[PDB]
Design a binder for this molecule. Sequence first.
Ligand SMILES: [Cl-]
Length: 148
Amino acid sequence: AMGFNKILVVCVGNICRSPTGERVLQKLLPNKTVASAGIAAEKSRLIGKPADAMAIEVAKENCVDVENHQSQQLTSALCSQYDLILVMEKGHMEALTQIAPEARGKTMLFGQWIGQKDIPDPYRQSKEAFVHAYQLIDEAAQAWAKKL
Ligand SMILES: [Cl-]
């Protein structure tokens, strides 16, 4: 009914949380187009980095494919192509507003339907941190799927 067909999942690096969230939500909603971007996307010179090796490993154990990901920079042009934008932290909303002020009105929280929780960043931590990040992303995505 809302027409949220193209969904953009956003974090800072676009290598841990947002590619995980993108692929978990994509598996739950096969007829939707789910992509991801970073407020300060991690790049190798100018090439988009793949998802963190541990993020790929943890998702693989939960039957979610996070291979063939290339990080991309969040821009106003990119935001204009999506119907719904889902940030990983409430704090990300201020930075997103500076890049894409026209995206105000379609920027929502990834963990909105799980008590408005921020998804913990597992970057540079052990496998267990990647497990907890995945588990909370899964709970949040399942709650979004019932509303989409
Ligand atoms: Cl991040």
